[PDB]
């Protein structure tokens, strides 16, 4: 049950290789969300714990991943946010549903081999 930091990195980066290419449905994603530029005030109201694909890459880079179903509830995690705040009509929940088509497809045969 032990994963070396490197060992996850390379395999769990290609997934959020993945998600990065989507284009134009990953670039709200590409940071965290500013609440303050975005003219959002309300937004950690409802989002307790914000993530995002530049925040998830850092902690492959770094190590903060002791195992790999961490990763994966840290993508659901800016999937659900996005779901939680954004109304069903707006880009950011459309393109969400798209990075979590792509995303489910990318984990299964990388969680199944990590197992
Ligand atoms: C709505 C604010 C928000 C964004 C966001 O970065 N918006 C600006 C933006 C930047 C780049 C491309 C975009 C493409 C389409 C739409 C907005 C884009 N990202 C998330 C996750 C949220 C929330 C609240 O969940």
Same mark, same amino acid.
């Given at each position: 049950k032990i994963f070396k930091p490197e060992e996850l990195r390379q395999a769990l980066m290609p997934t959020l290789e993945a998600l990065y290419r989507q284009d134009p449905e990953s670039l709200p994603f590409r940071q965290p969300v500013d609440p303050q530029l975005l003219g959002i005030p309300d937004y950690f109201d409802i989002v307790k714990n914000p993530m995002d694909l530049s925040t998830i890459k850092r902690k492959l880079d770094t190590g903060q991943y002791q195992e790999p179903w961490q990763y994966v509830d840290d993508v659901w995690?800016?999937?659900?946010?996005?779901?939680?705040?954004? =109304?069903?009509?707006? =880009? @950011?929940?459309?393109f969400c549903s798209?990075?979590?088509? @792509?995303?489910?497809?990318?984990?299964?045969?990388?969680?199944?081999?990590?197992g």
């Open positions: 995690l800016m999937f659900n946010n996005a779901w939680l705040y954004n =109304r069903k009509t707006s =880009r @950011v929940y459309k798209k990075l979590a088509e @792509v995303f489910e497809q990318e984990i299964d045969p990388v969680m199944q081999s990590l």
